[PDB]
């Protein structure tokens, strides 16, 4: 869902934040911000797997 | 007859795939007392192709 | 495109429009952000004045 | 002379030298990497490094 919102994706959902400015993002840009989302879910459910 | 040299075939270059380049000859006229310095772009160090 | 010339003589800058027409350092105007950031040094020292 | 040259013997000494041109280029090109621009100057282009 988040990706979708960031890159050129066939992905049927809802944008809400058109207005703010942003990037056609490519495969390295958009696995950078994969990363944050991967971290910030395993440190708020105390996972360290 | 026993052992003739092997040719090298497969070479393999990383850089520009160019054999032509340009080369001032004669330096430019900067400063001069017709144009102010701040007109010409190389005041600002800005990189030029 | 947005290319910057001197005046002469007395003669006020002028700047392009995007019609392709050059207009004096006065009246009201509308810029992309993405200008300012490519020429931010340039711009600085044309316009502040 | 070290300065001059047989004029008669031009054509022998270019066909050598277009020889040369050849050889010298007898290679392959490489893949290198890339990255996206973070900057507004291209539409998020990816650039050769």
């Given at each position: 869902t988040l990706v979708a919102q960031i890159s050129e994706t066939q992905y049927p959902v809802d944008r809400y934040l058109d207005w703010i400015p942003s990037l056609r993002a490519s495969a390295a840009t958009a696995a950078t911000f994969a990363e944050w989302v991967n971290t910030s879910m395993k440190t708020a459910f105390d996972l360290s797997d | 007859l026993l052992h003739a040299d092997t040719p090298r075939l497969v070479t393999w270059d990383a850089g520009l795939c160019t054999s032509f380049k340009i080369v001032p000859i004669v330096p430019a006229?900067?400063?001069?007392?017709?144009?102010?310095?701040?007109?010409?772009t190389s005041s600002y160090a800005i990189q030029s192709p | 495109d947005c290319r910057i010339s001197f005046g002469m003589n007395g003669a006020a800058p002028m700047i392009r429009d995007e019609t392709g027409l050059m207009v004096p350092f006065e009246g009201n105007w509308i810029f992309p952000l993405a200008l300012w950031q490519m020429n931010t040094r340039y711009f600085n020292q044309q316009f502040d004045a | 002379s070290v300065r001059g040259a047989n004029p008669l013997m031009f054509r022998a000494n270019v066909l050598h030298m277009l020889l040369e041109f050849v050889l010298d280029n007898l290679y392959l090109n490489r893949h290198t990497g890339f990255s996206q621009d973070?900057?507004?100057?291209?539409?998020g282009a990816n650039l050769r490094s």
């Open positions: - | 006229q900067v400063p001069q007392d017709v144009l102010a310095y701040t007109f010409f | - | 973070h900057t507004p100057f291209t539409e």
